[PDB]
Swiss-Prot record:
It catalyses: a tRNA precursor + 2 CTP + ATP = a tRNA with a 3' CCA end + 3 diphosphate; a tRNA with a 3' CCA end + 2 CTP + ATP = a tRNA with a 3' CCACCA end + 3 diphosphate. It comes from Archaeoglobus fulgidus (strain ATCC 49558 / DSM 4304 / JCM 9628 / NBRC 100126 / VC-16). Gene3D superfamilies: Archaeal tRNA CCA-adding enzyme catalytic domain, Beta Polymerase, domain 2, CCA tRNA nucleotidyltransferase, domain 2, Poly(A) polymerase predicted RNA binding domain. It comes from the Archaea. It is an enzyme of class 2 (transferase). Changing R50A: High decrease in both AMP and CMP incorporation. Homodimer. Its EC number is 2.7.7.72. GO terms for molecular function: ATP binding; CCA tRNA nucleotidyltransferase activity; CCACCA tRNA nucleotidyltransferase activity; magnesium ion binding; tRNA binding. CTP binds at S47, R50, H133, K152, Y161. InterPro entries: CAA_C, CCA-adding_arc, CCA_tRNA_nucleotrans_2, NT_2-5OAS_ClassI-CCAase, NT_sf, NuclTrfase_I-like_C, Polymerase_NTP_transf_dom, tRNA_NucTransf2. GO terms for biological process: RNA repair; tRNA 3'-terminal CCA addition; tRNA surveillance. This is CCA-adding enzyme.
Amino acid sequence: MKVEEILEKALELVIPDEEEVRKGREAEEELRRRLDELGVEYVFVGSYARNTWLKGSLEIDVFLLFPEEFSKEELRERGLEIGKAVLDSYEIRYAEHPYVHGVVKGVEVDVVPCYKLKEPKNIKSAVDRTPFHHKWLEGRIKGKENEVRLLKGFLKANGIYGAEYKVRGFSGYLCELLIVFYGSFLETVKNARRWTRRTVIDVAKGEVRKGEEFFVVDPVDEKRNVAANLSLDNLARFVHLCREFMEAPSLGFFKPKHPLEIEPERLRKIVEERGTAVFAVKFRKPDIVDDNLYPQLERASRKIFEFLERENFMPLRSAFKASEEFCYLLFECQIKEISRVFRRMGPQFEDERNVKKFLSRNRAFRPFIENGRWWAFEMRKFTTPEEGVRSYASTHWHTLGKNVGESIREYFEIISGEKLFKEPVTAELCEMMGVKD
RNA sequence: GGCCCGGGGCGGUUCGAUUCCGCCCUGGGCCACU
């Protein structure tokens, strides 16, 4: 409980055992043969090609190199023919461009078509940049593969390992650039403790500077930020995590935390103690990939949060959860109920025109003067957070994300109390309210 | 699909909106999947 001690024991969790290695090697062997019998020009890339893949994440990436002149359609058609002839089982997949995923001797394989080019310039799509990323990394990360694995294991165990929207963490590529930069997991963790939201790490220049945002420049393109999708808060969590690790090394930082399920009854009591209004907007999950849905859940969540603050319900925090079946937007407010009346600021007394206009409005309670200007008492259409949101969501469904909104437009409800504690959101609620133990 | 910058139109709210809440056209940049 020295560092060195823990890291040795940690390699145990991050490095693939001999069976997983062999299993992959054997598949690479077969995959090459099958590809050669067809005489296809390919190149293995990704963490597998560079022996940096984390334990239990064995997947082989094979990029097909096509002449700079082929049409985008040739690549897809030809790419599909090859993946389809070479894989034990396949399944077309999509993204920037379509490609084929599948299996071979029991291991996940991605057969991706891209253009074979020289010089990062003339890149038509991200998939074309991948080969250069691989070439830059292959000779430089050799020997530090386990350092990469410790870093990956660390991030994964703390819920910030991938760069996709459901996570907004650190991509695999980013991890390797960091190891290349600092030389090891420890040096990376030691220095990350000094990272700021203004830090800029330029790998190719072997330099660190102050910029306008956290930026890790791509060795293959200076203009690209490899950490582009690492959220501000996730950056912070990492920095904090490193400080804590160096202050008290523990194998715990590499072991996923137990969901720590709680009994709803206890949750009910805690919410009672807090005296807040806790509720959730429930609707049906649109049939879209997490990549389109999560940013939508974030938007919808925010727009409602903002509605809650300007409408003065004093929201504390918000959260959200997606199930196979529905999606939940969670909220906690300090105000369970507010009065019907509120005061509206009017014009300064000297402004006769607007004053006369301001008094023309027929109201229930007769305006008054205070510190030089007129004020009027007004009445709200709703006096509870749940009421406001029911109103907001029913009329502002369109500003809650193209799909999420369209779904809420056809059906939503607000849940609170016992009926809420029964939904698959109890874990998100504890996290949101800082429940501990 | 989401986010950033910019234009052309509107609706609602308000004493008063370019400036609050939103809606259509629309130009550029960027992010995630591969």
